[model samples]
Target: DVQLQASGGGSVQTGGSLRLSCAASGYSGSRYSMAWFRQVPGKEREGLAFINDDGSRTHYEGSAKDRFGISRDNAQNTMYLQMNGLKPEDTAMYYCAARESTWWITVPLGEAEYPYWGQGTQVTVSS
Candidate 1:
């Protein structure tokens, strides 16, 4: 019954940063992993990072390693992504997902296999 809900989408000005959050529920906060991603229309998806529930470890993708950060609040069962240095090119839809409990046995570790996903939030960076 794990669930994820994402929010914090709208319009942001260029050079302004944007922060999005995901609320996780119906599962043990310390037992799973969460990830954030972005995709521009008609383009390939970009991975931000995969963060452990305890906020102790993170594996960020090459593209996001420079400008994005991932964090978790275990007490609140929430995950967050902060993307700095916004530009019009940053406008895209963002999503949060929770790794399925069976991911390790069912698939390669660190590979994305999201069984619970938040509805994407579309963010627009404007001048």
Candidate 2:
């Protein structure tokens, strides 16, 4: 079992992209994907994307990838998240999770909460 937590600055420039890293404390990378998600100020959170430890393909829903990205370093078992074209609306808490294949194979298997989840990184947009 692994627990994840995100750590980064809370404020970032509106036009500039925000980058954060999620560190896994108790899990192995080979068994799961590093998943990232976002929750806007008042709106529901949307799945941003997820990546394997080897920097392989990222899984995202439809056009969401246009502003979201994810990456991971196997050696550190840490995942990185980047959001491009940042705006005030992008300000929110971003989280990372350890996910497994069972999540996709089983309908509503975990709903949106499979494996472990990070405490989340909160980003506030300004300027």
Candidate 3:
């Protein structure tokens, strides 16, 4: 049973920067796809970034394009998300999820979806 644990959320000032982390267990870090997501209260979840199954690529979407970064230390079974240029709107709950397909799996990319998700970490941004 693969699991993901998320950490590193707290209050931050507007215009400041912060980072959050997700630690993986019960699988090989270098072989699976890991992604970060964010959700504001009463809003839909947004995809932040992801480390591909081969651990060779990263992708970001929406607001994540401007100040979000994703990284992985496969040797440590960890993935990280960094956000900068904070705004009050940035305050939200964040999460990490892992896709079922591994590097050796030939599943169609579209079919490989996040099946294991971490509990969200709440972030608050204030002036």
Best by TM-score: 3
- Tens digit of lDDT per residue, candidate 1, span 30-71? 456788877888888876677764666777776577888889
lDDT of 3 at 21: 92
Per-model TM-score on C-alpha atoms: 0.84, 0.78, 0.85
User: Quick one: best lDDT, which candidate?
Assistant: 3
Residue range 68-110, candidate 2, lDDT tens digits: 6777776777778777778877777887777655243322222
The lDDT for every candidate, in the order shown, is 0.77, 0.69, 0.80
List the candidate 1 regions with Cα displacement exceeding 4 Å: 27-30, 100-112
Q: Which portions of model 2 show Cα errors greater than 4 Å?
A: 27-31, 61-64, 102-113
Q: What TM-score does candidate 1 reach?
A: 0.84
Tens digit per residue, CA lDDT, model 3, 9-90: 9999999999999988874434567888888888888777777765667777777878988888877788889999989998
**Segments of candidate 3 deviating more than 4 angstroms:** 27-30, 102-112
RMSD of 1: 3.3
Q: What ordering of candidates by lDDT runs from best to worst?
A: 3, 1, 2
